[PDB]
């Protein structure tokens, strides 16, 4: 619970998530863009207006918030094994001579 470091009383507007995308992300895909999402057919020319929205939205993290809305840093370690020789092995402690 990274409450102390990432919480701004004003809010830390620098942490954000994507509210709307046309399709579910493919596994391990990375997607970074600012493109307007519409509901109507109008192109809308990239303005904040009916059927025009900015897709990223902030988490508004703020200290006086409950456990549910508090920063939680996540580290997803994965293990990749290929036909090439392995190079990341494990301390392998020993015995005295």
């Amino acid at each position, epitope marked *: 619970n990274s409450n102390k470091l990432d919480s701004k009383v004003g809010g830390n507007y620098n942490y954000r998530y994507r*509210l*709307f*995308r*046309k*399709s*579910n992300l493919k596994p391990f895909e990375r997607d970074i863009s600012t493109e307007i*999402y*519409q*509901a*109507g057919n109008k192109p809308c020319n990239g303005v904040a207006g*009916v*059927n025009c*929205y900015f897709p990223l*939205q902030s988490y508004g993290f703020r200290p006086t*918030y*409950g*456990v*549910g*809305h508090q920063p939680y840093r996540v580290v997803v370690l994965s293990f990749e094994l290929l036909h090439a020789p392995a190079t990341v092995c494990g301390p392998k402690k020993s015995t005295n001579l």
Partner: antibody
Amino acid sequence: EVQLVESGGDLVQPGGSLRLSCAASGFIVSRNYMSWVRQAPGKGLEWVSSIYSGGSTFYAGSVKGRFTISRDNSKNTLYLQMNSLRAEDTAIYYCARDIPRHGGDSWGQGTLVTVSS
Amino acid sequence: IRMTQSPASLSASIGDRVTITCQASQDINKYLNWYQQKPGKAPRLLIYDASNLETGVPSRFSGSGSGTDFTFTISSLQPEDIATYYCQQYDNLPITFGQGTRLEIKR
């Protein structure tokens, strides 16, 4: 105008299968969040199902596996296939588009389902 | 969430100041919408997020809250204000509405 004629259903025996249809004026069904509320006569509105902008489906506890939701790109017409019905499902069903955080809404007039014997 | 609305029969004369209180069982932060359902006609969305009244509404309805307890206010009770108002939370997957507060007018 976001006006909805979500008009399908009138009634069946217990154990039947009805098919609702919703409809759409300014937007496309498959691009915006939509859901289906359920208002029993004289009772607080209860939430049955909800679709997302990428096909994610979420249901309610009482409708796990009897109800289905389905989205139709060709003619709008957000479809909700009611199956495995019973004698306590009688309620008014309203089609609903919810834009999640920026705030607008469509709740269409809604249709009556009285399913009985 | 066990949504709780405390006033169900509340009756004020023409042009009065009333208040509706919707209460929850956890922290829903600010994601609680206020609806207005006239008899027969489909519900309208009045205050999304608990702090933002939708444009085009008359400008009397105001709401403010955070975390569990929320409140809804009516600034000028025009005669054409008879309806039933609902509070909805839209970010916890078991979306549960509230009971409604049937408002009436006295003369």
